[PDB]
Design an enzyme around this catalytic site. Structure first.
Site, mmCIF file in Angstrom:
data_model
loop_
_atom_site.group_PDB
_atom_site.id
_atom_site.type_symbol
_atom_site.label_atom_id
_atom_site.label_comp_id
_atom_site.label_asym_id
_atom_site.label_seq_id
_atom_site.Cartn_x
_atom_site.Cartn_y
_atom_site.Cartn_z
ATOM 1 N N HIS A 127 -87.145 46.976 1.400
ATOM 2 C CA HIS A 127 -85.848 47.708 1.378
ATOM 3 C C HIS A 127 -84.534 47.121 0.957
ATOM 4 O O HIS A 127 -83.582 47.841 0.987
ATOM 5 C CB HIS A 127 -85.469 47.931 3.064
ATOM 6 C CG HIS A 127 -85.382 49.438 3.338
ATOM 7 N ND1 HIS A 127 -84.279 49.911 2.744
ATOM 8 C CD2 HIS A 127 -85.578 50.135 4.589
ATOM 9 C CE1 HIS A 127 -84.076 51.305 3.332
ATOM 10 N NE2 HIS A 127 -85.028 51.374 4.634
ATOM 11 N N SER A 144 -79.800 57.819 10.221
ATOM 12 C CA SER A 144 -79.461 57.335 8.964
ATOM 13 C C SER A 144 -78.918 58.659 8.208
ATOM 14 O O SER A 144 -79.664 59.832 8.384
ATOM 15 C CB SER A 144 -80.566 56.628 8.234
ATOM 16 O OG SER A 144 -80.077 56.220 7.105
ATOM 17 N N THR A 160 -75.987 53.990 2.654
ATOM 18 C CA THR A 160 -76.002 54.910 3.988
ATOM 19 C C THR A 160 -74.852 54.651 4.855
ATOM 20 O O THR A 160 -74.660 53.431 4.969
ATOM 21 C CB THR A 160 -77.393 54.900 4.759
ATOM 22 O OG1 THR A 160 -77.564 53.808 5.663
ATOM 23 C CG2 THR A 160 -78.707 55.097 3.912
ATOM 24 N N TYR A 170 -79.330 55.724 16.691
ATOM 25 C CA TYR A 170 -79.093 55.276 15.286
ATOM 26 C C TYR A 170 -80.001 56.486 14.401
ATOM 27 O O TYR A 170 -80.910 56.844 14.380
ATOM 28 C CB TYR A 170 -79.589 54.140 14.851
ATOM 29 C CG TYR A 170 -79.225 53.804 13.212
ATOM 30 C CD1 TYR A 170 -78.114 52.836 13.050
ATOM 31 C CD2 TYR A 170 -79.886 54.266 12.268
ATOM 32 C CE1 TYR A 170 -77.904 52.512 11.496
ATOM 33 C CE2 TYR A 170 -79.853 53.870 10.999
ATOM 34 C CZ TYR A 170 -78.716 53.130 10.573
ATOM 35 O OH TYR A 170 -78.145 52.970 9.313
HETATM 36 C C1 LIG Z 1 -96.795 63.821 11.695
HETATM 37 C C2 LIG Z 1 -95.283 63.886 11.979
HETATM 38 C C3 LIG Z 1 -94.658 63.851 10.794
HETATM 39 C C4 LIG Z 1 -93.774 62.751 10.693
HETATM 40 C C5 LIG Z 1 -93.107 62.920 9.327
HETATM 41 C C6 LIG Z 1 -91.741 61.717 9.120
HETATM 42 C C7 LIG Z 1 -90.898 62.120 7.758
HETATM 43 C C8 LIG Z 1 -91.010 60.642 7.199
HETATM 44 C C9 LIG Z 1 -89.712 59.776 7.492
HETATM 45 C C10 LIG Z 1 -89.890 58.560 7.533
HETATM 46 C C11 LIG Z 1 -88.969 57.707 6.474
HETATM 47 C C12 LIG Z 1 -89.136 56.146 6.462
HETATM 48 C C13 LIG Z 1 -88.299 55.691 4.976
HETATM 49 C C14 LIG Z 1 -86.991 56.002 5.208
HETATM 50 N N1 LIG Z 1 -86.182 54.612 5.496
HETATM 51 C C15 LIG Z 1 -85.230 54.554 6.119
HETATM 52 O O1 LIG Z 1 -84.364 55.645 6.548
HETATM 53 N N2 LIG Z 1 -84.548 53.197 6.533
HETATM 54 C C16 LIG Z 1 -83.232 53.185 7.178
HETATM 55 C C17 LIG Z 1 -82.142 52.796 6.211
HETATM 56 C C18 LIG Z 1 -80.603 52.793 6.600
HETATM 57 O O2 LIG Z 1 -80.315 53.654 7.534
HETATM 58 O O3 LIG Z 1 -79.900 52.121 6.159
HETATM 59 C C19 LIG Z 1 -83.265 52.228 8.349
HETATM 60 N N3 LIG Z 1 -84.054 52.791 9.745
HETATM 61 C C20 LIG Z 1 -85.160 53.306 9.715
HETATM 62 C C21 LIG Z 1 -84.157 51.828 10.562
HETATM 63 C C22 LIG Z 1 -83.078 53.809 10.209
#
Ligand SMILES: CCCCCCCCCCCCCCNC(=O)N[C@H](CC(=O)[O-])C[N+](C)(C)C
Length: 623
Positions: free
Chosen positions: A341, A457, A468, A455
């Site tokens: 990240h 994002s 972000t 939180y």
């Molecule tokens: C079965 C149900 C379906 C679930 C589907 C979920 C969709 C995918 C979402 C997952 C995204 C993961 C990577 C994105 N990363 C991200 O936002 N990092 C954030 C970066 C930031 O906020 O600076 C940190 N955080 C996770 C702690 C809030």
């Protein structure tokens, strides 16, 4: 050809005229700070905090701002947060595994036969390399947020904006209500990695390296995906080179070197520089410069939880976590992207993730029939080799063990809320995102009986070097409405509930819009912390205050992404007693993938989110 998109506007065309991430005026940040505290603190705690916000506002804070503003005027080429945000990541000596690296899982190919491991690994490998190529050629379409897509996402506009100089180009997209995004993170998507060093870890990129890294069963391999000219190697060779790796029957080493990348960052700084002194620099370099890293697990997915553990941490033997990212293809052809990240925020990753899925499914480079090229794998495929001192066998075995400890503490489960999603809620004139953030709050208070620091994002990527800002979903409205639904569900009437939900929905949208605009409070206060500490003053008293630390101790941490390429995704909780909620609101359903440790329960917190959503819709249906 070998490009998977053919843009007439050059990919980096708008980069020079992106606006600067604005710095809020200070009075606002404090109001915004205190608004965010209101639902969480009790009476006297709130009093205390406000006193401090006054001190800081016309005392030390006023002077830090004066200086953050003047420094920003002197550094017009960048955003005021970038550097202090890269450092948030890079200086953290905790493990990156769980604490930072997230995953997202691809959907299968629709065509059954194409989900074979060899086939799929090859095609994904090839699209990824196609993408790199097209990025490099400037033939990837610039990232743009369109308010009026049928107006500005048209050859007509493109044919025209293309002649406008980069130093004025952003205004042409502006006047059409279109928002180009920062795209500088992309240069670190390939041939790039995180190097452990004492204090600041450091980001490495090598642009010349033509080769794929592949991890099977703990063993390291490399071979070429790009030739002397810079042209993609023959799919059928790559296919063969992978087939031949898939054969090797030497089992899992007594020392898989891939554990050192899950360690504390100082431990691994040092062990890494011992591998150097013991003669491995050259082989480290081969690992460090690989376009990316392809992990070929040799087991199938039993279910969603299994997939999730697998894509999020795996067993430890089979991922270089320092790498810019990891392309995982398992035995039933379930594939994902796990990524470091520090270098990027995953708009880039969603873009890459999206192109790659489209291209590999609609334009497979090989077919489940294709006969592998005749060639000499043993001479093209190098098998990597380490010199492992006593001390380094010691540290590998200590990494194995600290790894397996933590991984036993984690528990993830999922929900698929099928009574409707985006359609229904947009009909009732409500922000679908807020309704979800509402289910969370309400679910928590229904289960633990508290209201905790939350939180969300949000992207500031429309500005130069934009990263972000934080949405703060837990508001006074969300508290009141949650009490209403839970303590005294009967003291309030139907339409009376409907009104509160509109209050939430409303306030939420004001945050979402301000966040994206640079106009939240978290990045600002943080940028002020950093500058004290950096000029060598004491910490100002606002940050010492218990309430400040509590605000930044996110018991619920949340993040969403919409793509028809994603099946699910996930991340660890961000604190020992907390939740990792990845969620997605689709047309006709709502999905969550929730992670937790020992002090909390996921399955149960998901039973509450279900019920909270059932009551939400019933209230909206006039029941
Ligand atoms: C079965 C149900 C379906 C679930 C589907 C979920 C969709 C995918 C979402 C997952 C995204 C993961 C990577 C994105 N990363 C991200 O936002 N990092 C954030 C970066 C930031 O906020 O600076 C940190 N955080 C996770 C702690 C809030």
């Amino acid at each position: 050809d070998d490009y998977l998109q053919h843009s007439i506007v050059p990919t980096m065309h708008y980069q020079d005229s992106l606006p600067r991430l604005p710095i809020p005026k200070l009075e606002d940040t404090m109001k915004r700070y205190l608004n965010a505290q209101k639902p969480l603190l009790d009476d006297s705690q709130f009093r205390r905090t406000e006193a401090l916000c006054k001190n800081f506002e016309t005392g030390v804070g006023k002077e830090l701002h004066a200086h953050l503003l003047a420094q920003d005027k002197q550094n017009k080429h960048t955003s005021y947060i970038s550097g202090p945000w890269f450092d948030m990541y890079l200086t953290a000596r905790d493990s990156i595994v769980l604490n930072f690296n997230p995953f997202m899982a691809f959907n299968p190919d629709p065509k059954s036969e194409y989900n074979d491991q060899l086939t799929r690994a090859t095609n994904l490998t090839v699209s990824a390399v196609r993408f790199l190529k097209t990025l490099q050629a400037g033939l990837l379409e610039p990232e743009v947020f369109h308010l009026n897509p049928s107006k500005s996402d048209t050859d007509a506009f493109k044919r025209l904006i293309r002649f406008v100089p980069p130093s004025l180009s952003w205004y042409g997209a502006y006047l059409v209500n279109a928002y180009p995004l920062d795209m500088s993170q992309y240069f670190r998507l390939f041939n790039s990695t995180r190097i452990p060093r004492p204090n600041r870890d450091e980001l490495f990129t090598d642009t010349k390296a033509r080769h794929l890294l592949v991890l099977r069963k703990g063993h390291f391999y490399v071979f070429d995906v790009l030739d002397q000219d810079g042209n993609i190697v023959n799919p059928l060779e790559i296919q063969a080179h992978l087939k031949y790796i898939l054969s090797d029957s030497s089992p899992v080493p007594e020392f898989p070197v891939a554990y050192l990348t899950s360690e504390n960052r100082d431990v691994w700084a040092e062990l890494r520089q011992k591998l150097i002194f013991d003669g491995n620099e050259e082989t480290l370099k081969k690992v460090d410069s690989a376009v990316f890293c392809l992990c070929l697990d040799d087991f199938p997915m039993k279910d969603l939880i299994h997939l999730s553990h697998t894509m999020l941490h795996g067993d430890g033997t089979n991922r270089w976590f320092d790498k810019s990212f990891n392309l995982i293809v398992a035995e039933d052809g379930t594939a994902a992207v796990h990524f470091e990240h520090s270098w990027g925020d995953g708009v880039a990753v969603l873009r890459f993730f999206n192109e790659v899925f489209r291209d590999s499914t609609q334009t497979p480079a090989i077919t489940p029939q294709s006969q592998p090229a005749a060639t000499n794998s043993s001479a093209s495929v190098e098998t990597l080799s380490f010199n492992l001192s006593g001390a380094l066998k010691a540290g590998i075995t200590a990494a194995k063990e600290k790894f397996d400890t933590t991984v036993k503490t984690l528990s993830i489960d999922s929900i698929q809320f099928q009574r409707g999603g985006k359609e229904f809620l947009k009909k009732k004139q409500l922000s679908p995102d807020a309704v979800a953030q509402l289910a969370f709050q309400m679910a928590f208070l229904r289960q633990y009986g508290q209201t905790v620091a939350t939180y969300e994002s949000c992207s500031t990527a429309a500005f130069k070097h934009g990263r972000t800002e934080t949405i703060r979903p837990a508001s006074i409205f969300t508290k009141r409405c949650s009490e209403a639904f839970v303590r005294d569900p009967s003291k309030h009437s139907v339409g009376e509930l409907q009104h509160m939900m509109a209050e939430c929905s409303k306030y939420h949208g004001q945050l979402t819009k301000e966040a994206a605009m640079g106009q939240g409070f978290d990045r600002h206060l943080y940028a002020l912390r950093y500058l004290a500490t950096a000029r060598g003053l004491n910490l100002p008293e606002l940050y010492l205050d218990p309430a400040y630390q509590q605000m930044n101790h996110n018991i619920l941490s949340t993040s969403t992404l919409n793509s028809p390429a994603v099946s699910l995704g996930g991340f660890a909780p961000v604190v020992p007693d907390g939740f990792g909620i990845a969620y997605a609101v689709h047309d006709d359903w709502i999905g969550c993938n929730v992670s937790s440790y020992s002090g909390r329960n996921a399955r149960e917190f998901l039973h509450c989110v279900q019920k909270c959503l059932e009551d939400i819709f019933d209230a909206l249906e006039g029941k």
